[PDB]
Design a protein around this ligand. Sequence first.
Ligand SMILES: Cc1cc2nc3c(=O)[nH]c(=O)nc-3n(C[C@H](O)[C@H](O)[C@H](O)CO)c2cc1C
Length: 175
Amino acid sequence: MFRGIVQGRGVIRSISKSEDSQRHGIAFPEGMFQLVDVDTVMLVNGCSNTVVRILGDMVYFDIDQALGTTTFDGLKEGDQVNLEIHPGLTGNIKGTALVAAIEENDAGFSVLIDIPKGLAENLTVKDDIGIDGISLPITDMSDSIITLNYSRDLLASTNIASLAKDVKVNVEILN
Ligand SMILES: Cc1cc2nc3c(=O)[nH]c(=O)nc-3n(C[C@H](O)[C@H](O)[C@H](O)CO)c2cc1C
């Protein structure tokens, strides 16, 4: 099982799209490409993907089975991704959700996400949830909008700098 603790972030460098899937070539951060190889199953934005090819710090994943309930087909070259290598999150993304709002501040970012009933209707505060590979506790909830707090230090190792109103994220429902 995964911790939902992002070890570092990669940058999508290449994306070859074909009729069935898309081959994403992700440039990994120093130290992470040495910990994986072909057949390695890891978490990219919290989604279980299998390394299909690797050369230096360029890691490739064929993204297909996940294309329909994930955010991958909407990412482009240059985008940052959260990365986690195995040793809680299973890596099976339930679906996609949008950032309803986001309030930055000294401490960190209070991000509001509108969770559709299609993903889960039985959410309670204090529960954990995975957003793009980051496991966080639901600090607050009102109907379908949940509130999660992001520590500012995350900007150094995660993709969170891309969160804005209406930005789509991978959601994994826990427990
Ligand atoms: C071991 C394992 C490997 C997987 N590899 C891929 C993959 O290479 N490409 C993909 O699109 N989906 C893959 N999936 C499915 C995806 O990670 C995710 O769980 C769901 O597709 C989200 O709807 C994999 C799932 C597991 C359990």
